[PDB]
Write an enzyme that holds these catalytic residues in place. Structure first.
Site, PDB file in Angstrom:
ATOM      1  N   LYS A  37     -36.719 -39.784 -12.695  1.00 32.52           N
ATOM      2  CA  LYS A  37     -37.440 -40.839 -13.402  1.00 32.52           C
ATOM      3  C   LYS A  37     -38.830 -40.366 -13.817  1.00 32.52           C
ATOM      4  O   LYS A  37     -39.487 -39.592 -13.116  1.00 32.52           O
ATOM      5  CB  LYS A  37     -37.549 -42.091 -12.534  1.00 32.52           C
ATOM      6  CG  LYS A  37     -36.201 -42.664 -12.092  1.00 32.52           C
ATOM      7  CD  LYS A  37     -35.695 -43.765 -13.011  1.00 32.52           C
ATOM      8  CE  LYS A  37     -34.646 -44.629 -12.314  1.00 32.52           C
ATOM      9  NZ  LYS A  37     -33.514 -44.996 -13.226  1.00 32.52           N
ATOM     10  N   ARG A  50     -28.977 -42.731  -5.383  1.00 32.22           N
ATOM     11  CA  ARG A  50     -28.339 -42.392  -6.646  1.00 32.22           C
ATOM     12  C   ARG A  50     -29.032 -41.164  -7.211  1.00 32.22           C
ATOM     13  O   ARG A  50     -30.266 -41.118  -7.277  1.00 32.22           O
ATOM     14  CB  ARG A  50     -28.411 -43.556  -7.640  1.00 32.22           C
ATOM     15  CG  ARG A  50     -27.158 -43.729  -8.502  1.00 32.22           C
ATOM     16  CD  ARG A  50     -27.332 -44.820  -9.573  1.00 32.22           C
ATOM     17  NE  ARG A  50     -28.108 -44.333 -10.710  1.00 32.22           N
ATOM     18  CZ  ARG A  50     -27.678 -44.287 -11.966  1.00 32.22           C
ATOM     19  NH1 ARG A  50     -26.469 -44.714 -12.302  1.00 32.22           N
ATOM     20  NH2 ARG A  50     -28.478 -43.794 -12.909  1.00 32.22           N
TER      21      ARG A  50
END
Ligand SMILES: [Cl-]
Ligand SMILES: [Cl-]
Ligand SMILES: [Cl-]
Lengths: 265, 264
Positions: A213, A247
């Site tokens: 991210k 994840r």
């Protein structure tokens, strides 16, 4: 002792287009999925579209056409399948295929579908998202506001699902990360160091999804192609603090991080 | 509570007589500069020979390649550590006033102890299960390997502080991997109980775990070229309080500590 379970990210679209042959080839994403299981993925997280749906085609009929052969091949090998999708018609097919998880960036806001979700033994992962699909990107400036709002959004949505008949211990809470908390990085860090409160406040499992991210890149000044080290730093942090699910793309680098950390303890 | 990174720079040259020694030390400098930009507190200079065995001619060439890199680096004001075990090379380092002397043999020659005292270089006193000048037998079992090196530090420190070195300059490296036997538990044991070194000696500890093969035993992957299993171990040592970390992949390290500080 406890150990975070690994969700292996498999995006059918990027895996099918990496050759450059302009081919919708689910075969390339099936093999990628099988690789992730070998690297130690507990669950494969399927994605037939992108999460930011600015893209021209969001077709419900094709989103099922892509998940169709991958779910078939993975289910025959015993692979725990998780499909990531926000469209109720696509989740309806996931109920019909009896996949193990359903990942909704929208957090199941369509009560039309609740009764079917209840009957199926599908585990739901309930993501909080500050953004709205189709609308402009939100830069949520107030992190503590996003955190309390996230807690309210869960308290209401969990009760809504449980009234409809969904067993509550089949719900996993994903507070969202990076884009889903506002382009402000600090609120991403806030959720990361505060997610145990979510577990205690609801007695539910929590999924942390930090892999690659852009908030990680803003802390380290690193490009998307070189986020593995800040990613592993974050996934390890969530593990030590008690994340139930992680994840990630680099399942195997994560497996190595967890294997080394459990051995040292 | 921050760990300092040691960046590993290897100076390599072929066996033919110079002409182009510069375009080998020049890259080692370019390598060391890139490592500083990646977050290296100290550059660890390595100038091992083609055949790693001591000789009177090999020393003068090891010094020959350390000279221009050392000079160029502390011209830029970079802290320098030299990895060398040959006393004549260590002596040149004492005169070069490098910030650290990293001796894998653990300074087993008390003839050099006088010159080590007349300096301010820090001494990375390293332990090894197979050390020079010991009448003890090598140890097989880990908890015995641990207490063995615990006594090795105790005595080797006393020999150094006697000769005139200040104990505050002695950084302790317990060694890792093959240096503790083909036994992975040994390096695991030391990796978690190394705080016991710090408290029992009141001194800094270097952890050099990068790309060691024992990590492959825990993991089952190719640690010699892969980032994760090394970085997983380096982070552990950081949280356990390691004062110095020696590492090839400085950039991966540096960024993994930036994340762990934002989450502090
Ligand atoms: Cl609440
Ligand atoms: Cl491998
Ligand atoms: Cl690989």
């Amino acid at each position: 002792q406890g150990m975070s379970k690994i969700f292996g990210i498999v995006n059918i679209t990027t895996d099918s287009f990496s050759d450059g042959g302009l081919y919708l080839d689910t075969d390339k994403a099936i093999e990628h999925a099988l690789h992730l299981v070998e690297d130690g993925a507990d669950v494969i997280d399927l994605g037939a579209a992108s999460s930011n749906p600015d893209t021209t085609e969001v077709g419900v009929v094709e989103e099922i056409k892509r998940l169709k052969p991958v779910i078939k091949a993975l289910k025959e090998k015993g692979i725990s399948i998780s499909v990531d999708t926000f469209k109720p018609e696509v989740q309806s097919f996931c109920i019909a295929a009896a996949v193990d998880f359903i990942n909704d960036i929208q957090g199941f806001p369509y009560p039309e579908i609740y009764s079917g979700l209840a009957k199926s033994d599908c585990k739901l992962v309930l993501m909080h998202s500050v953004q709205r699909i189709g609308a402009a990107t939100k830069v949520e400036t107030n992190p503590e506001e996003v955190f309390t709002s996230m807690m309210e959004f869960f308290k209401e949505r969990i009760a809504a699902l449980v009234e409809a008949g969904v067993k509550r211990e089949r719900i996993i809470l994903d507070p969202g990360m990076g884009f889903f908390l506002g382009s402000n990085p600090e609120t991403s860090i806030l959720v990361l160091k505060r997610f145990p409160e979510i577990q205690e406040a609801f007695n539910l499992q929590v999924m942390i999804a930090v892999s690659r991210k852009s908030f990680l890149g803003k802390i380290t000044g690193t490009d998307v192609k070189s986020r593995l080290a800040p990613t592993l730093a974050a996934e390890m942090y969530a593990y030590k603090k008690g994340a139930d699910y992680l994840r990630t793309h680099d399942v195997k680098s994560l497996s190595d991080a967890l294997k080394i950390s459990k051995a040292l303890g």
